[PDB]
Amino acid sequence: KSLTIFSDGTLLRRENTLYFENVNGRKPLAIEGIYDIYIYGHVNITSQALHYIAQKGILIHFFNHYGYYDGTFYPRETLLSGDLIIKQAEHYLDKNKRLFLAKSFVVGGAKNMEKNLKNWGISSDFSNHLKELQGAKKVTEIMNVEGRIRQEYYARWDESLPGEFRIGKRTPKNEMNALISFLNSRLYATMISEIYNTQLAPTISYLHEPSERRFSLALDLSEIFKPIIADRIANRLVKKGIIKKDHFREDLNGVLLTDEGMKIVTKAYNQELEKTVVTRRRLIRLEAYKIIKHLVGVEEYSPLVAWF
Amino acid sequence: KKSLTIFSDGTLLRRENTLYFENVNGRKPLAIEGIYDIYIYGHVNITSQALHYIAQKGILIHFFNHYGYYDGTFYPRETLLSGDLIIKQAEHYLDKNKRLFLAKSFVVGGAKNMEKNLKNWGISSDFSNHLKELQGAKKVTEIMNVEGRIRQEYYARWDESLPGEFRIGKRTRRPPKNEMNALISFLNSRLYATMISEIYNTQLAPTISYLHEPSERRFSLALDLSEIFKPIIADRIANRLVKKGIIKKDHFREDLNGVLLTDEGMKIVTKAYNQELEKTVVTRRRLIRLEAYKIIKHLVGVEEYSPLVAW
Amino acid sequence: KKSLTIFSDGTLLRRENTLYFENVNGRKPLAIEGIYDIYIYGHVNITSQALHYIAQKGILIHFFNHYGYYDGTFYPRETLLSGDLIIKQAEHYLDKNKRLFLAKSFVVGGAKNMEKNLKNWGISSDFSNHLKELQGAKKVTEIMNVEGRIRQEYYARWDESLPGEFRIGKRTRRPPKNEMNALISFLNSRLYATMISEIYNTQLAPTISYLHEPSERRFSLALDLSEIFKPIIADRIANRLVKKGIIKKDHFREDLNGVLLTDEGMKIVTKAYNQELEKTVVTRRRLIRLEAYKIIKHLVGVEEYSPLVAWF
Amino acid sequence: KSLTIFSDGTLLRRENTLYFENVNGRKPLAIEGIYDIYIYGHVNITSQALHYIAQKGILIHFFNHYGYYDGTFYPRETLLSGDLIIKQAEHYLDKNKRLFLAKSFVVGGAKNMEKNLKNWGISSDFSNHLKELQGAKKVTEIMNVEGRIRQEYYARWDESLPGEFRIGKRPKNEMNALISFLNSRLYATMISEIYNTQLAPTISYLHEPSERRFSLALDLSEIFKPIIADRIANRLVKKGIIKKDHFREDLNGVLLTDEGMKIVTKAYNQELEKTVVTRRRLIRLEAYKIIKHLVGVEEYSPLVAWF
């Protein structure tokens, strides 16, 4: 399959064979069966042990300690591989493939919302709402409907949350609305990363119009995973009592978190990202795989439902 | 904003907030802001700090072979991007008629430089009769079958200026077994690199192309555009270097395949390349970018794509 | 071999084998072979290492006052020395003849430039009639008291060509009450410094002089030889500075006692000085050392002593 | 009087007074009675606090940590005085005052050499040569007759020394290096203890004050060479601290090994701290007596080793 290097070493070539210069000792890496390398950590490269990796047509993806994408070394050498980007664009032009994937993303979003609301013992009964998707033709209607669903989700979510942290209309005009608004952004960051870890192009999207200036697939995919990751930690942090008001300050426009709060949220977030049911982070990658297997037509696309 | 080619075997790193290059002997040059592309021609170790930093700064590292042949590219994450243009790139690739226009336009534009290139040198030039064969051809493979002919015949009739030692019988892909085919394919490699760079600077996705089938790791938009700029840069340098006599057999060395340049040949060609890649027209480098913008101008439907001939 | 003048208040130190001047802002310049003389106008701490190195290389530190006036001198150990020249230079001072012809020379060399200076400036020039009042005089006390009157006529024959504002009623050396007496006494002090520097680089003992009574503690040879070079360098600079209009009342300030220069004025005068000190004649600094060699050519008996008073 | 600072501190002026900041403290220095300050240590000076010293006309003589003259700070005013170097050259010119102080140096040396020999149990009878100096007219005779004196010293010194180290004739032999080395290092120490005064070291009497070298230490060496150089070069040969193993032959002559030079210096430096009012000071006191003679207060008496 592929390999992932967590330890911070140095990739090295010693007399015509690859090795790993981990602080404490050198190890050889047998790569004959490997066609892709994923590197996150502090790993020094050398142009000697890049010609060797490239001559065999292997691709190395560089990352931070955390998901942040740095770059990828595309060798001149390449295997058949086809284009997924064209397939992505082959979709969204045939408006009868777009609508499906779009409707799917939303149905997954609202189903995850339901399965989250169920874990907390609230009504949630959305089935008589999703229906509006399967008949709705154009995207703007699926969107306006997903808006209706979203304000319905929040409307029946705030019944389980303290008055201090009520989530009212859309938005940072509130305390709780700021917290979630922050985690959505940090999830967006993580999203661009776990997406870039494949060869899928992030700027061609379905439920959100791929338009000027930003990664529009993370927007689409977020619809499924905010309620799994973003919403839940916000819930826990509130009901467990780890954040009250000492963490929140109010700017001229809205509210936001203190330098102390962002670290607390970041901790709980990074802690919820490494939680096992497997790694909650990888599920982001698996859903992207499920898409890759749909774009080429192996298996139809399924959204992710939260059995946990 | 210039680029870099570091021949000496050192180590790239980032002690304080800047990049620094330690050669084996010892020193630490290189202010970053002001460089655009790094080309690694030597055995240079890179550190994850300067490798993450280069990615954070939007600079890419082009690696090259022992012999000067393009080995690969380090592509950082996409700073300035648009999917509303990429979707059009794919619509133009998918729709064969509109792909046919642009794919053909590249050969229409580049082979046109070649005639006007050889024309500037005082020789016979008749390529016009071949263009008809292209304009009639519908399939991609035939448009290639032509450029595989045009490319090899241009060489044949270019040779009646230069001395024997520098003769080009045929193109000889890696490895070439003659002289003067290293200088051209090596000079070409850097043009490929410079192309992959000046393409990044736009919103175009480099992996959707018309006259070349793209693959995951392949840059086929650079290859497509290269067809235009080889006769503008590669040929003209490879000419103006061979004529005035700045490179001789002392600079060429042989292996089993007879392809290689000495570090002085690589450095002088690199110098002359960097020197002539920007003289004035108010830049020759930007033309790489503007010619890419012209695609943007056609891909929306503002103005049809018109290739570049010569100022 | 340049010269250094540090107006910024910093710290001299060594750092293995080089000199470094760390201003009270962070950084460090200053080559070691670049100088034979340093001029301190600021508040600068010196380290025992850089002072022993300055001594090791034979560099002098010619410290100055708050106003720019000559304060002191750090005279390091003498690399080039000779006793037989010092002996002779003592024979010429001791023997009361063989000296007047040197004292006389210093003056008739000195105030002979003045006439050449007034000539270059287009002013009435007649000192050829004063030369007799000393030509025969016995003791130096006469030649000096005469050089005073001559000095007072060279001035007061010069203020006529200068703007009213810049005028020398008297010299008043320290403190100056009017303008043009600071700029002069200052350029005089700077030349005094340069003089002691170019004297060191010779074999002459700097403390035994002729027209001026010597002292074991003060260089009287710079004073004797300055009689020649004060009107050549200081006056000419202060003139081409006052005329071209490079210094005004915006620069000169009035303290509670006398007048002064501002750091903007002092830096310009020092600049103008070193800018005009290395000029084309060979360098004009060399002429100072060259004239110092002329004395040796008289002491040892090669050729009789003659001044350079020309413009060439 | 004058002041001497061995400690390594920092001289400064905080608010209109001289202050000496050493390790852990600040001590004012009362300068109202001082005409000269001597820095023997590592002392950083400030141009502000040096203008205070300069304003008072005090001299600062700088030294290395141990024994080497660096420079001197001459202020502009320099409270009035006469001139010593004039007197130094005046006595050279007047043939009498030169013939005197020439006779003195040598007869001062030869009596020290005599007391050197007697302390070792040798027959002296050297005074019989001194009469050749009594009446001697030219300097060449005072200096060439002194050769007999020195060679008779060595010839009669060789009777107490081992064969290995022989001064047979006069840097080329076992002993000729060992001794000449201390002569050179003594020259160094001498030209320093001279510089601490106002004496110009390059005006000399017994040796021609020819251009290019310190000739006063050259002359004065005649008196102290038997007191400092010879004396340790003897007990080092005797006590057995130097053998043939320390010496390293060259292509031309003999030399010391890097090991031996440190042994010689360590013993030399020990002599100077080995007070008889200190042994090194005698150089400066003998240097002063000349000053007290050059101005005509008291006649010059050469130094005779009582010890």
Partner: protein, 84 residues
């Protein structure tokens, strides 16, 4: 920030850059200016200088040095910057 600006501008255009760079940096020799700038007036120099000169004809080099560099002068010293 200490820079030394060396340049080659043609005639009838030189006097304007000579007059421009004189009110910002010091002058050492013909067509050589150096001095201490902050990283705001440097931008002003390279910016204002760009509009005074004509590209595709002339050339301007700006070395960015960390501090005043040591130097050895020959011929006549047009100006002694080597003294603080």
């Amino acid at each position: 920030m200490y820079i030394v600006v060396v340049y080659d501008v043609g005639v009838e255009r030189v006097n304007k850059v000579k007059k421009f760079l004189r009110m910002h940096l010091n002058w050492v020799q013909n067509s050589v200016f150096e001095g201490e700038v902050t990283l705001a007036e440097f931008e002003r120099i390279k910016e204002g200088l760009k509009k005074i000169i004509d590209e595709n004809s002339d050339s301007v080099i700006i070395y960015k040095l960390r501090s005043m560099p040591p130097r050895e002068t020959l011929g006549i010293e047009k100006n002694p910057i080597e003294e603080i």
